[PDB]
Design brief:
signal, monomer, antimicrobial, Lysozyme, Lysozyme C
Length: 130
């Protein structure tokens, strides 16, 4: 599923993402936009280390979910990476919350620092009614 911007903003709010561990809704929106383009089926194989990024938040299989083929990986979210490819993002949101509960916070996704951090991210939620 490819979410429309405001449809996603409202969904994320209902799932309690606004301000989760100090991360505003507009930042989660900026993260999803640059990681997957709001696409829940997006996947990206990292040939360099044999891991894969799954879903709307592009969560990595080395630490967060289990896909069986990633060397020395852990599954902190206790989820199959398959769960992060559903149209329903409840599982992906629960795992993203787990990711940021680590000291790095949103810095866990390098895309956040490059395209979201210290920017005016208002545009991501403008007009969505959230």
């Amino acid at each position: 599923k490819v979410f429309e911007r405001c449809e996603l903003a409202r969904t994320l709010k209902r799932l309690g993402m606004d301000g989760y561990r100090g991360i505003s809704l507009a930042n989660w929106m900026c993260l999803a936009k640059w990681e997957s383009g709001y696409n829940t089926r997006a996947t990206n194989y990292n040939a360099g280390d044999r891991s894969t990024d799954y879903g709307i938040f592009q969560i990595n299989s080395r630490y967060w979910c289990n896909d069986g083929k990633t060397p020395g990986a852990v599954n902190a979210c206790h989820l199959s990476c398959s769960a992060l490819l559903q149209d329903n993002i409840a599982d992906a949101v629960a795992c993203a919350k787990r990711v940021v509960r680590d000291p790095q916070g949103a810095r866990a996704w390098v895309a956040w620092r490059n395209r979201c951090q210290n920017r005016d991210v208002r545009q991501y939620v403008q007009g969505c009614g959230v």
